[PDB]
Amino acid sequence: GAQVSTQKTGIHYTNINYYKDAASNSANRQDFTQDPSKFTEPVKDIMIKSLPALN
Amino acid sequence: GAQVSTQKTGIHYTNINYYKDAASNSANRQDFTQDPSKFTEPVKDIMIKSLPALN
Amino acid sequence: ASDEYTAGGFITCWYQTNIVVPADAQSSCYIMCFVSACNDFSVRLLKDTPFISQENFFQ
Amino acid sequence: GYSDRVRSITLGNSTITTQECANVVVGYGVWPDYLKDSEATAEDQPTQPDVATCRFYTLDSVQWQKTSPGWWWKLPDALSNLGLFGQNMQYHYLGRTGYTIHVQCNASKFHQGCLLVVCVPEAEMGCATLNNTPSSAELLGGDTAKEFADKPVASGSNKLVQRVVYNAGMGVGVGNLTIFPHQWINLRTNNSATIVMPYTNSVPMDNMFRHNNVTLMVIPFVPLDYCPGSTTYVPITVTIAPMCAEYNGLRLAGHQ
Amino acid sequence: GYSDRVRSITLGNSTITTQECANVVVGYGVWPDYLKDSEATAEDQPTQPDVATCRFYTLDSVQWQKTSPGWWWKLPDALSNLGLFGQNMQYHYLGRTGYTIHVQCNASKFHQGCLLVVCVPEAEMGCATLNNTPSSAELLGGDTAKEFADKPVASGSNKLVQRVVYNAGMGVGVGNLTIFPHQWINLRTNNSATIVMPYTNSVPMDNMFRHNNVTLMVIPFVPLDYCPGSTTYVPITVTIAPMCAEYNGLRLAGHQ
Amino acid sequence: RVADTVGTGPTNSEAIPALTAAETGHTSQVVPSDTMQTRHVKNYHSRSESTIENFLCRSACVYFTEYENSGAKRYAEWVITPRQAAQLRRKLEFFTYVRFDLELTFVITSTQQPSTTQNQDAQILTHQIMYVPPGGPVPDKVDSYVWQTSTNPSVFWTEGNAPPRMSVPFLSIGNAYSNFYDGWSEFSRNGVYGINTLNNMGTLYARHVNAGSTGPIKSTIRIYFKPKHVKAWIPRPPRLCQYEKAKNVNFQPSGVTTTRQSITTMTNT
Amino acid sequence: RVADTVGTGPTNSEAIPALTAAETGHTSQVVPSDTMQTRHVKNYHSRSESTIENFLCRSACVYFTEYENSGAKRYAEWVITPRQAAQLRRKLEFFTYVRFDLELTFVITSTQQPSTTQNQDAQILTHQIMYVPPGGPVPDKVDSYVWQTSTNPSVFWTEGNAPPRMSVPFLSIGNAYSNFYDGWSEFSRNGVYGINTLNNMGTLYARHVNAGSTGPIKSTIRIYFKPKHVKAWIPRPPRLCQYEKAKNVNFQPSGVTTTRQSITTMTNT
Amino acid sequence: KVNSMEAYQIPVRSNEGSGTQVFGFPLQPGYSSVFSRTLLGEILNYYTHWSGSIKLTFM
Ligand SMILES: CCCCCCCCCCCCCCCC(=O)O
Ligand SMILES: CCCCCCCCCCCCCCCC(=O)O
Ligand SMILES: *C(=O)CCCCCCCCCCCCC
Ligand SMILES: *C(=O)CCCCCCCCCCCCC
Fold first, then answer.
1. Which cellular compartments is it found in (chain H)?
2. By 3-state DSSP, what share of chain F in percent is helix, strand and coil, each rounded to 5?
3. Domain harbouring A5, CATH code
4. Which of E120, E253, F28, G115 is the Cys-Cys partner for E90 at CB 3.0 to 4.6 Å?
């Protein structure tokens, strides 16, 4: 029960785990998910770039 | 002849055994079976919660 | 183990209506308390009990 | 395996058990509920605390003696100081509630007696001195039972309530109090009395300090008795639980 | 017309009635039965006396006093001298049984007390003197109750069992004996305790003299009390009945 | 997993989930929902770490001895028992009968000893651990033919390597290991009383295959036991009194718990 | 990946991507294309190495102590905290709450000590590292029964081998580890103030299973922490002032930045 | 009384008033001297964390 995933490039690297605990697993280095509109733009009413902010 | 089972979480971990004796195998950590009505409630006649115990 | 962050609460008992007994029956009784866990009880992180000590290997 | 004698009432944090009782006497056949949009006047949205207000508040115990005439507790004023029922009651101009009144009194097989547990809607009481009206401190007793009198109260220049039990402090016949929802605690067969009062009033909501809509009265019709040896201290404990309490008109706290 | 309080147990010649009781506590949820061909080792055919062995043997009565610490009866050894159960037990190398233990104690409405009736599988007991092991005559009492001690037994150069009740003679907490099948004889609600023990052991059959697999213990947690006038002599009678007794390995009689 | 709480509201009936008769020998099954107004809560809590395998399956030191490079103590011997250590013994004794496989790990460690011996330049020490099942010939010296282990199992381990480990089956004659035994070994209700009548696992000998140096060296073998594939029957009260002997229940009486003052004191003293 | 620039040309409208009102508490999203003529560029640049896992997932030394062959310091103990080291503490403190698994690597190193002791010829040292969760019995000597670890987890490691390593779960009671705590431990708003009210991870003891030689030897255990499988919430300003305590925010005030001369000086001073 | 069966008895008596306190102990199943030696408290002492409801059956 292996898992072939991609390597970091600019191939694949097969992986199998041997331990019964998920804590015994390797780090999760390949999660490039992102969402800055929690911090950049946490405003209630939408702010459009091309429009005057205060109208 | 491997066996892919689940890891403890809040994945899988493949396992193969190499020894001819079952005593050489790993512990059985994932058996969460349970039956307290051997000790809690070992009474002959059934006792219903909402009813008076002695009637 | 104790920690005030992890404080639990207090269990108290009070007389609601004093103990009434007839004549010729004892006026001072006893009560017994039993402790069991409910169906939602669970314990975590295994360690050694502080309740069993040893100075030398028993013989 | 059942019994008409067993009971268990759960309201909020509190549960109440009985191993000897009569039915629960439900108000005027009415079980308490909230105010309808059809019957409402106050346009502001109510606070209905729920589990915080509608729960079992056990006031002080009182001693039943071979010579006790009776007792009375006004209703909004009794729980006026108890928990969050008393708080909401102070911050709000208007309030509305029903109750589950559980009067408890246990004796033994060698003891005898019989109490009338009534719920008198609008127990407007009289004064000892005919010209005056009793004082607020004479009619009311927060969580501390006010007691009836064995004999006529003297009409000086007071504002004393005319407590003689046989007239119930209302100028009526105490034996006719049986029209108001009630039960009896005959020590021979009973152990407690439970009365579920619905909201009785001519207005949908009223102020809880200015007006006490119901008055609980515990009057012993057949006196406590027992032969020597039989335990002498027989207390009576009153446990009341508000039911479907709403509060309209929020402002600063108090009454004035 | 029924009642959870009534009972009648018929085993052989004997019948047992109860007019006040709790359920029958069945061993570890297991009702006694015979040994299966799957679990058997001894190849010889067993003797299963039936009605002659599996019947109600009522041992000696013991007196519950305001100061009694408790009592204990080892199990195969108690009935080791009683009837045909004791006979088969002597002629046979191997034996296997379960029991229906009926502890009886009736007082009145003016009496109070509460006994713990347990069945301790393998009650290996300790010695007063730490270096020795108790004597066979100190641990065992055929049909005659062996009794616990009120206070610590002195550790001289004896082979006395360390009888202090609060440690149950096993170095444990007497209040945790509740894991072993049990019942209570609260004189207020009870009249007797019935426990149906299945065969508990790590081997399919064992010798009945060399090893006492279960130990019955009657330890009063809340002492006998009564006001003067209330009858003082309150006895406890123990009635045990073997269940599904088989015997393998016949030879001459005895133990040596 | 653990059970979730059900949303409860008020109640006014003759149903009494709270009143019972504890004399029945039956534990009540009341839950918060029965004596109060509960909210629905979803329990994801798991009782995984409290299974008997997780409780018992952890290496515990059960005993340890020493042997030397020279002198009298040149080889060691230990009659196998889990009762010499307070810690593991007490966990196993939560149950009357236990059945399991074992995992043996040994931590062998040596220490140079004080001597007037000059020019010491030790060579690597290799140790031999040998099991002598009940009945086989026993080593009477570091060099008796016995150490050939033609049939006895034995581990040869050179220092500096990973700890020697092997597993063992359920070696009992009974269908379960008996933790307690209320009986004797003789039919005349005499002889031994208690669990020792049952303990017959044999002995374990250890020795230095080589002396290694001119100076003195003393080694200490630590035996670790780890119950794998465990089955436990008939639970019992945990040990209250401290252990006095390794062969018997002998305890010295101690009080039920520690104390505090009044039954009203919210604090341990 | 990073966003590519769009080819832009001239503009002459009432659209103002550059003028805003920063009072809104909203960060502007202007890009080069908005205030100039841009060329199309294809960005293959990746923000892979700046993910929270890559930032935090690297072994950092969090603490280290020493124990000896002889004397008083024969075993060591450390109450677990990531706050004794400036480096790892500061990275974790970029977030208010963090949740993660841990990878523990220990680098145990020994040094021979100065003595008048003649004929030293050390034997290989084996060490034992033991974890005592909050509540368990603590070793009061190098030889208290406590070191049996019948239930406590512990690593036995012989010198010269690869560094002992094991991973640990998210051991918190809360649904996330709290890095900061603006509160007390007592409801009377008293007692402890701050994160220490929350730190209760237990202690870690280490010792020499064997002395090994006649001469003195002192060992130094270095504990390394590596947050695997990390989740971090509510980010905050990186620590400016230097750390003063390991249990509290206590800082000594320092200026906003370093200086230069005039607001016109293109160079740091 | 801890060295006796009295540790187990909760004294109840016929008073000259109600509202009196019968007993009082904190909610610390593994720590309080009351619960620490119970079946629940002994098991809890082998673990570091705990969660759940508890039943206190009074007889
Ligand atoms: C080199 C080979 C070593 C083999 C180790 C064998 C150890 C046997 C372990 C027996 C286990 C626990 C049993 C207690 C016995 C009893 O009291 O009945
Ligand atoms: C040999 C076993 C060793 C086990 C190592 C256990 C170490 C626990 C680590 C806890 C991690 C970081 C937590 C900070 C705690 C807090 O402030 O809330
Ligand atoms: C899925 O894994 C089936 C293919 C197995 C490939 C061989 C596995 C290599 C060794 C794994 C043993 C696991 C270690 C606990
Ligand atoms: C089933 O196992 C077929 C797949 C085999 C995967 C490779 C096995 C890896 C090494 C195993 C040898 C067994 C050791 C005795």
1. Virion; Host cytoplasm
2. 10, 35, 60
3. 4.10.80.10
4. E253
Ligand 3 lined by A19 (C-beta under 6 Å): no
Chain F: closest CA distance from residue E203 (Å):
5
Mutate to test the pocket of ligand 3, among B11, B13, B16 (most ligand atoms within 8 A of CB): B16
Task: Give me the residues paired with residue G52 across strands.
Answer: none
Alpha carbons within 13 angstroms on the beta-carbon side of residue F243 total 26
Q: What is the CATH number of the domain that holds G266?
A: 2.60.120.20
* Domains, in order of start, for chain E: 1-256 (2.60.120.20)
Q: Which residues lie closer than 8 Å to E43 by C-beta, 6 or more apart?
A: none
Taking CA–CA distances from H13, the nearest residue in chain D reads D231
Find where tokens 């005039």 sit.
Answer: G262
Q: Is the dihedral angle over the CA atoms F82, F83, F87, F93 positive or is it negative?
A: positive
C-beta atoms surrounding D238 within 10 Å = 23
Judging contact as 3 or more Cβ pairs under 8 Å, the answer for D and G is no
Determine how many CB atoms are found less than 10 A away from the CB of residue G224. Answer: 20
Contact between G61 and G85 (Cβ < 8 Å):
yes
E23–B43 CB contact, under 8 Å: yes
The whole domain housing G124 covers 1-269
Give the domain range for residue B30: 1-55
- Would an 8 Å CB–CB cutoff place E34 in contact with chain H? no
CB pairs under 8 A between A and B: 32
Q: Which residues of chain E neighbour H9 with C-beta distances below 8 Å?
A: 221-222
Question: Under an 8 A CB cutoff, do D236 and C17 touch?
Answer: yes
Ligand 3 binding pocket includes B26 (Cβ within 6 Å): no
Strands D192-197 and D25-26, bridge-based pairing: parallel
Atom 17 (ligand 1) nearest CA: F199
| CB of G130 closer than 8 Å to CB of G149 | yes
**E212: exposed, middle or buried (Cβ count in 10 Å: 0-12, 13-18, 19+):** buried
CB contact under 8 A, E179 and H39: yes
* Size (chain H), residues: 59
Tokens 């002849």, residue?
B1
What residues have CB less than 8 Å from F108, skipping those under 6 apart?
Answer: F127, F129, F157, F159, F163, F164, F206, F219, F220, F221, F222
H16 with D233: Cβ contact below 8 A: yes
Residues in C touching F66 (Cβ below 8 Å): none
Rounded CA separation A13/A5 (Å):
6
CA torsion F62→F68→F69→F71, rounded to 10°? -160
CB D62 within 8 A of CB D71: yes
Resolution value (Å, 1 decimal): 3.5
**Cβ within 8 Å, pair H14-D60:** no
- DSSP structural state of residue G251: -
- To test ligand 2's pocket by mutation, which of G83, G128, G168 has the most ligand atoms within 8 angstroms of CB? G168
- Smallest Cβ–Cβ distance between F12 and the set D2, D13, D100 belongs to D100
Pairing of strands E192-197, E25-26: parallel
Torsion sign over Cα E139, E145, E148, E150: negative
CB atoms within 10 A of CB G39: 10
Contact F202, F132 (CB under 8 A): yes
Closest chain E residue to B47, measured at CA: E23
Q: Is the dihedral of CA E214, E215, E218, E219 positive or negative?
A: negative
The Cα–Cα gap between G78 and G84 comes to: 11
| Residue length of chain E | 256
Q: Which helix (H) or strand (E) holds D90?
A: helix D83-91
Count: domains in chain A: 1
